[PDB]
């Protein structure tokens, strides 16, 4: 019986990446508000 | 986007362009590599995207993530029909996993059989997860 | 205040239209903070050349009330994983640098030489400054 480790290793490190996009996701429109106002402020 | 280029940008969790530790190999393995040990003991302390990008590329031009992931779940197709069990799965998963909530493991799992056949094509699977 | 922004569009107007590229530095120099977003929205409808009255129209949908300083500091607060509230200089390069609309590296390089003094930022506080000065 081989080992199911490997194949949950990598299961688990995509859906962990998947979990990062959805909460960068969540901010970043908040960076893109902080970059219009640097962009306002450099005018 | 690129999948290695985000895959960087999504586990660079401090965010000063740098990918280090267990962050590294995750990312590695977030685009459906598993290294081998001799690989994962040779990795530099850290890596900013120049050098993940590099070793990404050279790995990638020796090793098939599509064709490596179904030949790991074809060891567990006992039927011998593109298919394994999904309770199998979900209960490895929940066994040896790390990074997952048990509500992340199940969505998965109804991913991968939709129409809750208690089988997962994995091939697939596989497919229709590394677009 | 009027008659000084009529005056700057039709200085950098050509037949009476503005390409929206000058649009956003003349709304930026209103005190406004349109982003690359609004910008290619507003193209959908209108165009990327502008009259006086659409750039007014443009200019009145680029207020964005939605700002506030909280949001913006956890949106920085998420690359701060001990939430003490520091970033390192390094850290805000690459972050606005990689995320969001990046900024290039001479904009970067800018605001970096006119708002950071050590190399540990206190984001909330420099959010706080960027938040400042907007036309309300």
Request: hydrophobic content about 40%; aromatic content about 10%; charged content about 25%.
């Amino acid at each position: 019986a081989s080992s199911w480790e490997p194949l949950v290793s990598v299961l688990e490190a995509y859906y962990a990446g998947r979990r990062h996009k959805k909460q960068l996701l969540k901010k970043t429109p908040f960076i893109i508000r902080a970059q219009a106002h640097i962009r306002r402020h450099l005018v | 986007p690129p999948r290695v280029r985000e895959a960087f940008a999504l586990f660079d969790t401090d965010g000063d362009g740098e990918i280090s530790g267990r962050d590294l190999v995750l990312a590695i393995r977030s685009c459906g590599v598993s290294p081998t040990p001799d690989e994962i003991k040779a990795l530099p302390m850290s890596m900013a995207w120049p050098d993940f990008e590099a070793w990404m590329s050279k790995k990638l031009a020796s090793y098939n993530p599509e064709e490596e992931l179904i030949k790991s779940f074809k060891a567990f197709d006992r039927s011998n029909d593109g298919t394994v069990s999904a309770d199998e799965l979900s209960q490895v998963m929940l066994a040896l996993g790390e990074l997952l909530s048990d509500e992340e493991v199940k969505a998965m799992i109804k991913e991968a059989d939709p129409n809750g056949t208690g089988k997962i094509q994995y091939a697939n699977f596989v497919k229709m997860l590394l677009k | 205040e009027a008659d000084e922004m009529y005056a700057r569009f039709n200085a950098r107007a050509s037949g009476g239209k503005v390409s929206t590229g000058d649009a956003m530095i003349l709304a930026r120099q209103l005190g406004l903070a349109p982003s690359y977003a609004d910008k290619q929205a507003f193209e959908e409808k209108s165009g990327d050349n502008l009259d006086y009255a659409s750039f007014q129209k443009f200019v009145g949908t680029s207020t964005h009330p939605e700002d506030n300083i909280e949001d913006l500091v956890e949106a920085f607060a998420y690359f701060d994983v001990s939430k003490h509230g520091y970033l390192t200089r390094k850290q805000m390069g690459n972050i606005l640098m990689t995320y969001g609309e990046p900024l290039t590296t001479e904009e970067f390089n800018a605001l970096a030489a006119e708002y950071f003094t050590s190399d540990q930022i206190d984001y909330r506080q420099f959010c706080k400054a960027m938040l400042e000065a907007e036309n309300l």
